[PDB]
Write a protein that binds this ligand. Sequence first.
Ligand SMILES: [Cl-]
Length: 166
Amino acid sequence: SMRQREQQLLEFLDRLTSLLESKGKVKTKKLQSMLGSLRPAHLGPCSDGHYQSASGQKVTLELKPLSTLQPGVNSGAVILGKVVFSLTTEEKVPFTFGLVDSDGPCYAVMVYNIVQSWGVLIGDSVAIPEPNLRLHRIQHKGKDYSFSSVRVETPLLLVVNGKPQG
Ligand SMILES: [Cl-]
């Protein structure tokens, strides 16, 4: 049997893994036009060369594909993608969305600590400085999930359509 918290969490992972595989059921033509609309300018101030690192220092960031992210904190990198779906759990944590930055696979992004109003729309550009990639391998209650997520500490770190969120 399952209790309520675990049941809705497994439901969420079911939906998330399905949405990642279908890229939010967004049609190929729409995906290509979304991807075509990505601009270097959408990095916003991450581009600047005077981006203030979370550990204190002023560092320069390099745009890299999602597919090249390594587990853990990807120091000195930034990623830039298009939103193809969003969802959350019954507990409204985390705020989760899928990004594509290429013709290859979609990546989940999980955003924590949303205090004020926040969200993103399908078709938005999102830049994530120094992304923290987690490689989930979950086996629980006869279910099995294997997917990556980028853990975002606060929305304030993100750049959306080239506008810093903080
Ligand atoms: Cl949502």
